Ligand binder design. Structure first.
Ligand SMILES: [Zn+2]
Length: 431
Protein backbone atom coordinates (compact mmCIF):
# COMPACT_ATOMS: atom_id res chain seq x y z
CA UNK A 1 0.00 0.00 0.00
CA UNK A 2 1.34 3.42 -0.99
CA UNK A 3 -0.10 6.84 -1.86
CA UNK A 4 1.02 9.00 -4.78
CA UNK A 5 0.64 12.81 -4.66
CA UNK A 6 -0.57 14.46 -7.82
CA UNK A 7 -1.20 18.01 -6.71
CA UNK A 8 -0.90 20.12 -3.56
CA UNK A 9 2.78 19.23 -3.11
CA UNK A 10 4.69 22.29 -1.84
CA UNK A 11 1.61 24.21 -3.01
CA UNK A 12 -2.03 24.71 -1.98
CA UNK A 13 -4.14 24.03 -5.05
CA UNK A 14 -4.53 20.81 -7.03
CA UNK A 15 -5.34 18.22 -4.36
CA UNK A 16 -5.42 14.71 -5.92
CA UNK A 17 -3.64 11.66 -4.50
CA UNK A 18 -3.60 8.19 -6.05
CA UNK A 19 -3.95 5.31 -3.61
CA UNK A 20 -2.38 2.10 -4.90
CA UNK A 21 -3.19 -0.92 -2.80
CA UNK A 22 -4.65 -4.38 -3.25
CA UNK A 23 -4.46 -4.24 -7.03
CA UNK A 24 -7.00 -1.40 -6.74
CA UNK A 25 -6.35 2.26 -7.55
CA UNK A 26 -8.34 4.86 -5.59
CA UNK A 27 -8.18 8.57 -6.36
CA UNK A 28 -8.37 10.75 -3.23
CA UNK A 29 -9.70 14.13 -4.35
CA UNK A 30 -9.20 15.57 -7.81
CA UNK A 31 -9.03 19.34 -7.62
CA UNK A 32 -8.05 22.08 -10.02
CA UNK A 33 -4.88 24.13 -9.71
CA UNK A 34 -5.58 27.81 -9.06
CA UNK A 35 -3.76 31.10 -8.96
CA UNK A 36 -0.46 31.27 -10.80
CA UNK A 37 -0.54 27.47 -11.45
CA UNK A 38 -3.92 27.58 -13.24
CA UNK A 39 -2.40 26.47 -16.58
CA UNK A 40 -1.37 23.11 -15.15
CA UNK A 41 -5.05 22.19 -15.46
CA UNK A 42 -4.29 21.78 -19.15
CA UNK A 43 -1.27 19.57 -18.40
CA UNK A 44 -1.56 15.79 -17.85
CA UNK A 45 -2.68 14.17 -14.60
CA UNK A 46 0.54 12.18 -14.39
CA UNK A 47 -1.39 8.93 -14.32
CA UNK A 48 -3.93 7.19 -16.56
CA UNK A 49 -7.41 8.23 -15.48
CA UNK A 50 -8.78 5.17 -17.29
CA UNK A 51 -7.02 2.92 -14.78
CA UNK A 52 -8.81 4.27 -11.69
CA UNK A 53 -11.21 1.91 -9.95
CA UNK A 54 -12.94 4.62 -7.90
CA UNK A 55 -12.60 8.21 -6.66
CA UNK A 56 -13.46 9.67 -3.23
CA UNK A 57 -14.13 13.37 -2.55
CA UNK A 58 -13.43 15.13 0.80
CA UNK A 59 -15.38 18.34 0.09
CA UNK A 60 -16.81 20.47 -2.68
CA UNK A 61 -14.26 23.27 -2.90
CA UNK A 62 -12.77 23.74 -6.36
CA UNK A 63 -9.19 23.05 -5.14
CA UNK A 64 -10.27 19.43 -4.41
CA UNK A 65 -12.96 18.67 -6.99
CA UNK A 66 -12.13 21.00 -9.88
CA UNK A 67 -10.33 18.42 -12.04
CA UNK A 68 -12.97 15.70 -11.74
CA UNK A 69 -14.76 16.77 -14.90
CA UNK A 70 -11.37 16.48 -16.63
CA UNK A 71 -11.07 12.98 -15.24
CA UNK A 72 -14.18 11.89 -17.12
CA UNK A 73 -13.21 13.99 -20.10
CA UNK A 74 -10.32 11.61 -20.62
CA UNK A 75 -12.03 8.26 -20.25
CA UNK A 76 -12.50 7.43 -16.57
CA UNK A 77 -16.04 6.23 -15.81
CA UNK A 78 -15.82 4.74 -12.33
CA UNK A 79 -17.87 5.80 -9.29
CA UNK A 80 -17.19 8.98 -7.30
CA UNK A 81 -18.06 8.78 -3.61
CA UNK A 82 -18.81 11.77 -1.38
CA UNK A 83 -21.23 12.90 1.33
CA UNK A 84 -24.71 13.98 0.25
CA UNK A 85 -23.68 17.52 1.25
CA UNK A 86 -20.48 17.37 -0.79
CA UNK A 87 -22.50 15.99 -3.69
CA UNK A 88 -25.21 18.67 -3.76
CA UNK A 89 -22.74 21.49 -3.12
CA UNK A 90 -20.56 20.22 -6.00
CA UNK A 91 -23.28 20.76 -8.54
CA UNK A 92 -23.54 24.43 -7.68
CA UNK A 93 -19.77 24.75 -7.48
CA UNK A 94 -18.97 23.08 -10.80
CA UNK A 95 -21.71 24.69 -12.84
CA UNK A 96 -20.30 28.00 -11.64
CA UNK A 97 -16.72 26.97 -12.45
CA UNK A 98 -17.79 26.18 -15.96
CA UNK A 99 -19.61 29.47 -16.38
CA UNK A 100 -16.91 31.61 -14.80
CA UNK A 101 -14.01 30.09 -16.67
CA UNK A 102 -11.77 31.98 -19.10
CA UNK A 103 -9.99 29.13 -20.85
CA UNK A 104 -11.80 25.80 -20.31
CA UNK A 105 -10.02 22.48 -19.88
CA UNK A 106 -13.31 20.61 -19.65
CA UNK A 107 -16.77 21.10 -21.12
CA UNK A 108 -20.40 21.07 -19.91
CA UNK A 109 -20.55 17.56 -21.31
CA UNK A 110 -17.81 16.57 -18.86
CA UNK A 111 -19.70 18.18 -15.99
CA UNK A 112 -22.97 16.25 -16.00
CA UNK A 113 -20.97 13.13 -16.90
CA UNK A 114 -19.09 13.68 -13.65
CA UNK A 115 -22.05 14.71 -11.53
CA UNK A 116 -23.71 11.58 -12.90
CA UNK A 117 -21.22 9.17 -11.32
CA UNK A 118 -21.38 10.72 -7.85
CA UNK A 119 -22.54 8.21 -5.27
CA UNK A 120 -23.43 9.07 -1.65
CA UNK A 121 -21.13 8.08 1.22
CA UNK A 122 -21.62 9.30 4.76
CA UNK A 123 -19.39 9.52 7.84
CA UNK A 124 -18.74 6.06 9.27
CA UNK A 125 -19.92 4.23 6.18
CA UNK A 126 -17.49 1.62 4.89
CA UNK A 127 -16.63 1.10 1.26
CA UNK A 128 -14.87 -2.02 -0.07
CA UNK A 129 -12.57 -2.58 -3.06
CA UNK A 130 -10.58 -5.79 -3.04
CA UNK A 131 -8.81 -6.08 0.31
CA UNK A 132 -9.09 -2.27 0.54
CA UNK A 133 -11.56 -0.79 3.06
CA UNK A 134 -12.35 2.96 2.92
CA UNK A 135 -14.41 5.31 5.13
CA UNK A 136 -15.08 9.01 5.77
CA UNK A 137 -14.14 10.82 8.98
CA UNK A 138 -15.50 14.16 10.31
CA UNK A 139 -13.31 17.04 9.08
CA UNK A 140 -15.52 20.02 9.92
CA UNK A 141 -14.18 22.28 7.15
CA UNK A 142 -17.42 22.53 5.15
CA UNK A 143 -20.79 20.85 5.13
CA UNK A 144 -20.05 17.22 4.33
CA UNK A 145 -16.29 17.72 4.67
CA UNK A 146 -14.33 14.62 5.59
CA UNK A 147 -10.94 12.99 5.94
CA UNK A 148 -10.27 9.56 4.44
CA UNK A 149 -9.36 6.48 6.44
CA UNK A 150 -7.91 3.87 4.07
CA UNK A 151 -7.30 0.46 5.54
CA UNK A 152 -5.79 -2.60 3.90
CA UNK A 153 -2.81 -4.96 3.54
CA UNK A 154 -2.54 -4.92 7.33
CA UNK A 155 -1.84 -1.20 7.07
CA UNK A 156 -3.79 1.98 7.80
CA UNK A 157 -3.58 5.34 6.01
CA UNK A 158 -5.28 8.58 6.96
CA UNK A 159 -5.82 11.29 4.37
CA UNK A 160 -6.82 14.62 5.98
CA UNK A 161 -8.24 16.69 3.14
CA UNK A 162 -8.81 20.10 4.76
CA UNK A 163 -9.15 20.03 8.55
CA UNK A 164 -11.52 22.73 9.76
CA UNK A 165 -11.00 25.35 12.46
CA UNK A 166 -12.73 23.82 15.53
CA UNK A 167 -13.11 27.15 17.32
CA UNK A 168 -15.88 28.47 15.04
CA UNK A 169 -19.53 27.49 15.54
CA UNK A 170 -21.16 26.44 12.26
CA UNK A 171 -19.66 23.07 11.39
CA UNK A 172 -19.17 20.35 14.02
CA UNK A 173 -15.75 19.59 15.52
CA UNK A 174 -13.27 17.76 13.34
CA UNK A 175 -12.71 14.18 14.50
CA UNK A 176 -9.40 12.96 15.82
CA UNK A 177 -7.96 10.64 13.14
CA UNK A 178 -7.54 6.99 14.03
CA UNK A 179 -3.97 5.94 14.90
CA UNK A 180 -2.47 5.29 11.44
CA UNK A 181 0.57 3.80 9.73
CA UNK A 182 0.72 6.92 7.58
CA UNK A 183 -1.01 10.31 7.59
CA UNK A 184 -1.15 12.45 4.48
CA UNK A 185 -1.87 15.85 6.09
CA UNK A 186 -2.48 19.50 5.04
CA UNK A 187 -0.49 22.48 6.27
CA UNK A 188 -2.08 25.70 4.90
CA UNK A 189 -1.30 27.21 8.31
CA UNK A 190 1.75 25.25 9.40
CA UNK A 191 3.49 28.47 10.41
CA UNK A 192 0.91 30.01 12.79
CA UNK A 193 -2.32 29.62 14.80
CA UNK A 194 -5.29 31.98 14.29
CA UNK A 195 -6.63 34.71 16.58
CA UNK A 196 -9.23 33.05 18.87
CA UNK A 197 -12.76 32.86 17.48
CA UNK A 198 -14.55 34.40 20.44
CA UNK A 199 -12.55 37.60 20.58
CA UNK A 200 -12.69 37.74 16.78
CA UNK A 201 -16.48 37.78 16.87
CA UNK A 202 -16.37 40.47 19.49
CA UNK A 203 -14.05 42.63 17.47
CA UNK A 204 -16.41 41.95 14.58
CA UNK A 205 -19.56 43.21 16.30
CA UNK A 206 -17.53 46.17 17.59
CA UNK A 207 -16.79 47.21 14.02
CA UNK A 208 -20.39 46.82 12.94
CA UNK A 209 -21.72 48.80 15.90
CA UNK A 210 -19.54 51.79 15.21
CA UNK A 211 -19.88 51.72 11.44
CA UNK A 212 -23.65 51.24 11.37
CA UNK A 213 -24.50 53.95 13.93
CA UNK A 214 -22.59 56.62 11.97
CA UNK A 215 -24.57 55.35 9.01
CA UNK A 216 -21.55 53.80 7.36
CA UNK A 217 -21.21 50.82 5.04
CA UNK A 218 -19.56 47.66 6.26
CA UNK A 219 -17.91 46.02 3.24
CA UNK A 220 -17.23 42.28 3.55
CA UNK A 221 -15.48 40.57 0.63
CA UNK A 222 -16.36 36.90 0.83
CA UNK A 223 -16.31 33.48 -0.76
CA UNK A 224 -19.74 32.21 -1.70
CA UNK A 225 -19.39 28.66 -0.52
CA UNK A 226 -19.32 28.71 3.25
CA UNK A 227 -17.74 31.92 4.51
CA UNK A 228 -20.61 34.10 3.22
CA UNK A 229 -23.24 32.25 5.20
CA UNK A 230 -21.14 31.82 8.32
CA UNK A 231 -20.94 35.61 8.53
CA UNK A 232 -24.75 35.63 8.14
CA UNK A 233 -25.00 33.19 11.06
CA UNK A 234 -23.13 35.60 13.27
CA UNK A 235 -25.41 38.42 12.17
CA UNK A 236 -28.40 36.21 12.85
CA UNK A 237 -27.29 35.50 16.42
CA UNK A 238 -26.07 38.96 17.41
CA UNK A 239 -28.58 40.87 15.31
CA UNK A 240 -30.62 41.74 18.38
CA UNK A 241 -27.99 44.18 19.57
CA UNK A 242 -26.94 45.48 16.18
CA UNK A 243 -28.29 48.66 14.64
CA UNK A 244 -31.02 48.06 12.07
CA UNK A 245 -29.67 48.01 8.53
CA UNK A 246 -30.30 46.07 5.38
CA UNK A 247 -27.91 43.13 4.87
CA UNK A 248 -27.05 42.63 1.21
CA UNK A 249 -25.64 39.28 0.09
CA UNK A 250 -24.50 40.61 -3.26
CA UNK A 251 -23.62 37.20 -4.76
CA UNK A 252 -26.16 35.06 -6.67
CA UNK A 253 -23.83 32.14 -6.17
CA UNK A 254 -23.80 32.69 -2.38
CA UNK A 255 -27.60 32.67 -2.42
CA UNK A 256 -27.92 29.38 -4.29
CA UNK A 257 -25.62 27.96 -1.63
CA UNK A 258 -27.77 29.55 1.08
CA UNK A 259 -30.98 28.11 -0.40
CA UNK A 260 -29.34 24.72 -0.21
CA UNK A 261 -28.37 25.02 3.43
CA UNK A 262 -31.76 24.06 4.91
CA UNK A 263 -31.42 20.74 3.06
CA UNK A 264 -28.11 20.21 4.87
CA UNK A 265 -29.10 20.66 8.51
CA UNK A 266 -27.66 17.26 9.56
CA UNK A 267 -24.23 18.36 8.42
CA UNK A 268 -23.95 21.32 10.81
CA UNK A 269 -23.15 21.57 14.52
CA UNK A 270 -25.52 20.58 17.33
CA UNK A 271 -25.96 24.28 18.02
CA UNK A 272 -26.89 25.03 14.42
CA UNK A 273 -29.04 21.92 14.37
CA UNK A 274 -30.82 23.06 17.54
CA UNK A 275 -31.92 26.30 15.79
CA UNK A 276 -33.24 24.48 12.74
CA UNK A 277 -35.28 22.41 15.18
CA UNK A 278 -37.08 25.41 16.71
CA UNK A 279 -38.36 25.97 13.19
CA UNK A 280 -35.97 28.78 12.43
CA UNK A 281 -33.17 29.25 9.87
CA UNK A 282 -30.11 30.81 11.65
CA UNK A 283 -28.61 31.65 8.26
CA UNK A 284 -31.13 34.33 7.62
CA UNK A 285 -30.70 37.36 9.87
CA UNK A 286 -33.28 40.20 9.65
CA UNK A 287 -33.21 42.49 6.63
CA UNK A 288 -31.27 39.97 4.60
CA UNK A 289 -31.41 40.61 0.88
CA UNK A 290 -29.87 38.55 -1.90
CA UNK A 291 -29.06 40.79 -4.84
CA UNK A 292 -29.54 39.00 -8.12
CA UNK A 293 -28.58 41.47 -10.85
CA UNK A 294 -25.94 44.09 -11.62
CA UNK A 295 -28.41 46.96 -11.75
CA UNK A 296 -29.40 46.69 -8.08
CA UNK A 297 -25.83 45.83 -7.17
CA UNK A 298 -24.51 49.06 -8.66
CA UNK A 299 -27.29 51.11 -7.11
CA UNK A 300 -25.93 49.99 -3.76
CA UNK A 301 -22.67 51.79 -4.63
CA UNK A 302 -24.46 55.14 -4.52
CA UNK A 303 -26.91 54.25 -1.73
CA UNK A 304 -26.29 56.00 1.58
CA UNK A 305 -25.48 53.67 4.45
CA UNK A 306 -25.95 52.15 6.91
CA UNK A 307 -25.75 48.72 5.37
CA UNK A 308 -23.73 45.54 5.59
CA UNK A 309 -22.60 44.19 2.22
CA UNK A 310 -21.16 40.81 1.29
CA UNK A 311 -19.74 39.97 -2.13
CA UNK A 312 -17.00 38.09 -3.95
CA UNK A 313 -14.48 37.48 -5.25
CA UNK A 314 -13.27 36.77 -1.73
CA UNK A 315 -9.64 37.35 -2.82
CA UNK A 316 -10.75 40.54 -4.60
CA UNK A 317 -9.60 38.96 -7.86
CA UNK A 318 -12.74 40.44 -9.39
CA UNK A 319 -16.48 40.59 -8.88
CA UNK A 320 -19.07 43.02 -7.56
CA UNK A 321 -17.03 43.64 -4.42
CA UNK A 322 -14.59 45.73 -6.50
CA UNK A 323 -17.40 48.07 -7.48
CA UNK A 324 -18.38 48.33 -3.82
CA UNK A 325 -14.78 49.22 -2.91
CA UNK A 326 -14.33 51.64 -5.77
CA UNK A 327 -17.17 53.75 -4.35
CA UNK A 328 -17.05 53.01 -0.65
CA UNK A 329 -13.37 53.26 0.24
CA UNK A 330 -12.93 57.06 0.20
CA UNK A 331 -15.45 57.71 2.97
CA UNK A 332 -13.79 57.41 6.40
CA UNK A 333 -17.13 56.41 7.94
CA UNK A 334 -17.20 53.09 6.04
CA UNK A 335 -15.34 49.94 7.03
CA UNK A 336 -13.75 47.18 4.93
CA UNK A 337 -13.66 43.94 6.92
CA UNK A 338 -11.60 41.02 5.58
CA UNK A 339 -12.99 37.72 6.82
CA UNK A 340 -10.93 35.52 4.54
CA UNK A 341 -7.24 34.98 3.85
CA UNK A 342 -5.69 37.48 1.45
CA UNK A 343 -2.91 36.19 -0.84
CA UNK A 344 0.20 38.33 -0.88
CA UNK A 345 0.78 40.51 -3.92
CA UNK A 346 -2.93 41.08 -4.24
CA UNK A 347 -5.21 44.10 -3.84
CA UNK A 348 -6.08 42.72 -0.42
CA UNK A 349 -2.55 42.83 0.98
CA UNK A 350 -2.08 46.02 -1.01
CA UNK A 351 -5.00 47.66 0.80
CA UNK A 352 -3.82 46.39 4.16
CA UNK A 353 -0.54 48.15 3.32
CA UNK A 354 -2.54 51.37 3.72
CA UNK A 355 -1.16 53.55 0.94
CA UNK A 356 -2.70 57.02 0.51
CA UNK A 357 -4.80 55.68 -2.36
CA UNK A 358 -5.33 52.43 -4.27
CA UNK A 359 -5.99 51.38 -7.85
CA UNK A 360 -9.33 49.66 -8.47
CA UNK A 361 -11.17 49.21 -11.77
CA UNK A 362 -8.69 51.63 -13.36
CA UNK A 363 -9.00 54.52 -10.93
CA UNK A 364 -6.86 55.57 -7.99
CA UNK A 365 -9.29 55.89 -5.11
CA UNK A 366 -8.44 57.61 -1.81
CA UNK A 367 -8.35 55.03 1.00
CA UNK A 368 -10.10 56.54 3.99
CA UNK A 369 -12.55 53.81 4.93
CA UNK A 370 -11.08 51.94 7.90
CA UNK A 371 -9.69 48.50 7.19
CA UNK A 372 -9.86 45.39 9.35
CA UNK A 373 -8.58 41.85 9.22
CA UNK A 374 -10.40 39.20 11.19
CA UNK A 375 -8.37 36.05 10.65
CA UNK A 376 -10.24 34.31 13.41
CA UNK A 377 -12.75 33.51 10.66
CA UNK A 378 -10.44 31.04 8.90
CA UNK A 379 -11.94 27.73 7.87
CA UNK A 380 -8.56 25.97 8.10
CA UNK A 381 -7.16 24.37 11.24
CA UNK A 382 -4.37 26.57 12.58
CA UNK A 383 -0.90 25.35 13.53
CA UNK A 384 -1.88 24.65 17.13
CA UNK A 385 -4.89 22.67 15.92
CA UNK A 386 -2.72 20.94 13.28
CA UNK A 387 -0.28 19.79 15.97
CA UNK A 388 -3.23 18.50 17.95
CA UNK A 389 -4.83 16.51 15.19
CA UNK A 390 -1.44 15.02 14.24
CA UNK A 391 -0.52 14.15 17.83
CA UNK A 392 0.54 10.55 18.36
CA UNK A 393 0.82 9.71 14.68
CA UNK A 394 4.21 8.02 13.97
CA UNK A 395 4.58 9.10 10.34
CA UNK A 396 3.30 12.18 8.54
CA UNK A 397 3.62 13.31 4.91
CA UNK A 398 2.79 16.98 4.27
CA UNK A 399 0.70 18.45 1.42
CA UNK A 400 -1.26 21.65 0.77
CA UNK A 401 0.73 24.73 1.71
CA UNK A 402 3.90 26.62 0.84
CA UNK A 403 7.27 24.96 1.40
CA UNK A 404 8.00 27.27 4.34
CA UNK A 405 4.73 26.66 6.20
CA UNK A 406 5.08 22.91 5.67
CA UNK A 407 8.68 23.04 6.89
CA UNK A 408 7.66 25.01 9.97
CA UNK A 409 5.04 22.40 10.75
CA UNK A 410 7.56 19.70 9.89
CA UNK A 411 10.20 21.01 12.27
CA UNK A 412 7.71 21.02 15.13
CA UNK A 413 6.56 17.50 14.27
CA UNK A 414 10.13 16.24 14.04
CA UNK A 415 11.25 17.72 17.36
CA UNK A 416 8.16 15.99 18.70
CA UNK A 417 9.62 12.67 17.60
CA UNK A 418 7.40 12.14 14.58
CA UNK A 419 8.62 11.13 11.14
CA UNK A 420 7.82 13.56 8.39
CA UNK A 421 8.38 14.66 4.83
CA UNK A 422 6.92 17.08 2.34
CA UNK A 423 5.20 15.14 -0.44
CA UNK A 424 6.62 15.33 -3.95
CA UNK A 425 4.68 15.21 -7.17
CA UNK A 426 4.82 11.64 -8.50
CA UNK A 427 7.08 10.24 -5.82
CA UNK A 428 4.84 7.81 -3.94
CA UNK A 429 5.18 7.05 -0.23
CA UNK A 430 4.85 3.60 1.37
CA UNK A 431 1.95 3.26 3.77
ZN1 LIG B 1 -11.22 23.73 1.18
Amino acid sequence: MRIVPFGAAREVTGSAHLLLAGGRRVLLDCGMFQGKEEARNHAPFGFDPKEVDAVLLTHAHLDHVGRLPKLFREGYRGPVYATRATVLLMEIVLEDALKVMDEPFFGPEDVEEALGHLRPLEYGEWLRLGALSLAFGQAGHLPGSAFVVAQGEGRTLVYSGDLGNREKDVLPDPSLPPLADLVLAEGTYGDRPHRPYRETVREFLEILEKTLSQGGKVLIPTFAVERAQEILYVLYTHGHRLPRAPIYLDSPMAGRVLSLYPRLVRYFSEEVQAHFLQGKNPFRPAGLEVVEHTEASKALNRAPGPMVVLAGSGMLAGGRILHHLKHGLSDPRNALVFVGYQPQGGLGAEIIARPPAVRILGEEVPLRASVHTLGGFSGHAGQDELLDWLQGEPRVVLVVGEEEKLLALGKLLALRGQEVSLARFGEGVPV
